[PDB]
Inverted formin-2
Amino acid sequence: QEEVSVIDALLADIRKGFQLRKTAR
């Protein structure tokens, strides 16, 4: 399940990025 972890890290970028936007506004 090494391929799964790859995606798990790609999704985090979304949530994290949103946390910087929501707080920014």
